[PDB]
Amino acid sequence: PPAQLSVHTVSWNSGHERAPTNLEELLGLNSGETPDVIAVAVQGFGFQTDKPQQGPACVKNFQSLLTSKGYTKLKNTITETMGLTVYCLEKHLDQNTLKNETIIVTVDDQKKSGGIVTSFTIYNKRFSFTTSRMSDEDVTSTNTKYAYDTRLDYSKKDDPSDFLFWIGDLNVRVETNATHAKSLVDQNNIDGLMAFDQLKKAKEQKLFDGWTEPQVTFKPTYKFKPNTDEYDLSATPSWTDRALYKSGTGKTIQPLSYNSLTNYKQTEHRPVLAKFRVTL
Ligand code: HEM
Numbered sequence: 001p002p003a004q005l006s007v008h009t010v011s012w013n014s015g016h017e018r019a020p021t022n023l024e025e026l027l028g029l030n031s032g033e034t035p036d037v038i039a040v041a042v043q044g045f046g047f048q049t050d051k052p053q054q055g056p057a058c059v060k061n062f063q064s065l066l067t068s069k070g071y072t073k074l075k076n077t078i079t080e081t082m083g084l085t086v087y088c089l090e091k092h093l094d095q096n097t098l099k100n101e102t103i104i105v106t107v108d109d110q111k112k113s114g115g116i117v118t119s120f121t122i123y124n125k126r127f128s129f130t131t132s133r134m135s136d137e138d139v140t141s142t143n144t145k146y147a148y149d150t151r152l153d154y155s156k157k158d159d160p161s162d163f164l165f166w167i168g169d170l171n172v173r174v175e176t177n178a179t180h181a182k183s184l185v186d187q188n189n190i191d192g193l194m195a196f197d198q199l200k201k202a203k204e205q206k207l208f209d210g211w212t213e214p215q216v217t218f219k220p221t222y223k224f225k226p227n228t229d230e231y232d233l234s235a236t237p238s239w240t241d242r243a244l245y246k247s248g249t250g251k252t253i254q255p256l257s258y259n260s261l262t263n264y265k266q267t268e269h270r271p272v273l274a275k276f277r278v279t280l
Pocket of ligand 1: 012019044055
């Protein structure tokens with residue numbers, strides 16, 4: 001039982017885009033770090049049907065890179081609009097106690113909104129990783145547009161998990177006009193623009209209760225004109241992909257870094273990579 005473990009998470013509202021082939025950077029591996037757990041969440045369209053037949057390349061390329069580095073894929077789960085994969089270094093796994101479990105929650109009859117939770121235990125500590133997806137137009141258990149449901153929140157369980165991460169596009173946006181938002185971006189007044197971000201409003205409404213986001217120092221990750229760094233100002237620049245963390249049991253979770261990956265310009269959103277150190 002080590003004293004600490006490291007976790008990398010990445011999420012990307014990737015839409016109809018295929019997985020990139022350059023993955024080390026996406027997963028935070030390109031400077032030689034060797035995290036214990038890696039979670040990858042995507043939001044988009046057509047994953048399960050997989051008309052593009054891109055599933056095969058995803059498996060090949062992720063498994064090619066990660067197996068050589070000592071990772072085991074605990075689970076991949078896909079729906080039409082969401083994907084969540086969790087990897088862990090094989091050296092941490094005790095099959096007798098791992099209790100690897102995933103649930104899918106769907107909130108609409110077309111199964112386009114809801115979320116996924118994958119959980120597992122190592123060294124007698126329980127990890128849970130959630131992703132979620134909500135539409136602006138949906139009727140919901142919260143009567144909000146935010147991608148929260150209590151069924152996805154393993155901190156509000158009778159026996160809450162030790163380490164919890166929630167990654168993806170939460171459908172939280174910046175609630176001001178585009179002109180003001182862009183001016184704050186140009187001034188690098190990130191905290192000033194963050195004053196208009198809806199996560200605090202969601203929390204006031206008792207969504208994401210007690211969940212923390214690492215400090216944001218990067219510019220909004222949406223909406224870009226593809227292959228550029230220029231905002232498409234048809235939308236107010238916003239922080240779409242987010243990483244939130246919590247412990248149900250008083251364990252320390254220390255973010256090490258939290259950044260958008262601006263080299264992945266293929267789409268209107270930029271991926272967001274978080275790195276944490278957890279104390280068992
Ligand atoms: C940036 C975008 C994407 C990322 C990061 C991504 C990531 C992943 C990851 C990490 C896995 C698990 C790989 C493993 O086995 O180790 C996976 C599986 C899969 N992905 Fe993607 N994916 C993306 C886009 C897509 C798209 C556009 C499609 C097609 C609509 C798709 C279809 C699938 C399917 C069907 C699987 C499961 C296939 C199987 O289990 O044989 N993905 N993806």
